[PDB]
A paper describes a structure:
The PIN (PilT N-terminus) domain is a small domain with ~ 130 amino acid residues and is widely distributed in all three kingdoms of life. Utp24 is the endonuclease proposed to cleave the A1 and A2 sites. Depletion of Utp24, aka Fcf1 (Faf1 copurifying factor 1), inhibits cleavage at sites A0, A1 and A2 in yeast, whereas mutations of the active site of Utp24 specifically block cleavage at sites A1 and A2, but not at site A0. This suggests that Utp24 plays both a structural and catalytic role in 90S.
The crystal belongs to space group C2221 and contains one molecule in the asymmetric unit. The structure was determined with molecular replacement using the Utp23 structure as search model and refined to an Rfree/Rwork of 0.287/0.222 at 2.14 Å resolution. Although the full-length protein of spUtp24 was used in crystallization, the crystal structure contains only the PIN domain (residues 60–192). The N-terminal region was not resolved likely due to flexibility or degradation. The structure adopts a compact three-layer fold with a mixed six-strand β-sheet packed by helices α1-α4 at one side and helices α5 and α6 at the other side. A zinc ion is coordinated with Cys103, Cys132, His134 and Cys142, which are invariant in Utp24 orthologues. PIN domains contain commonly four acidic residues required for catalysis. The spUtp24 structure is well aligned to the recently determined cryo-EM structures of S. cerevisiae and C. thermophilum Utp24 (scUtp24 and ctUtp24) in 90S with RMSD = 0.86–0.98 Å.
Numbering used by the authors: 60 to 192
The structure:
């Protein structure tokens, strides 16, 4: 029910993991999912990219590409991990792309939210179905 127009919420560091592994975000997500995939970026994830500066410069530009869908934040100017977790609790129409061990263990509590991570020169499906309370 997630689609085969797939919506993938990007966390703050995911693009950087992609750049480190010589992965093009867009092709990598498309290849991982075998269908049109839409990378998504919340307002406050986008603000961190503005804020953290030099080593997120190339991430910032990539995040401003046409193919990104921007997700407005209906919350106070806050917390990138909490932002994703709150969004995928309301709307189960999302995947989460993160290599962050703590965010993943929070997402694994939420049924139905697949996790993608960068590994071995590809984006892989890290969490397919299983819940860990
Ligand atoms: Ca969309
Ligand atoms: Zn937010």
């Amino acid at each position: 029910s997630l689609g085969p127009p797939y919506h993938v919420i990007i966390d703050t560091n995911f693009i950087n993991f992609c750049l480190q592994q010589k992965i093009d975000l867009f092709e990598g997500l498309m290849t991982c999912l075998y269908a049109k995939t839409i990378p998504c970026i919340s307002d406050c994830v986008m603000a961190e990219l503005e804020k953290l500066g030099i080593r997120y410069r190339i991430a910032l530009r990539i995040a401003k590409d046409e193919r990104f869908e921007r997700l407005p934040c209906t919350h106070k100017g806050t917390y990138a991990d909490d932002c994703i977790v709150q969004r995928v609790m309301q709307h189960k129409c999302y995947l989460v792309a993160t290599n962050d061990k703590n965010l993943k263990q929070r997402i694994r509590k939420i049924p139905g939210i697949p996790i993608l991570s960068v590994a071995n020169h590809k984006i892989r499906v890290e969490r397919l179905v299983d819940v860990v309370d």
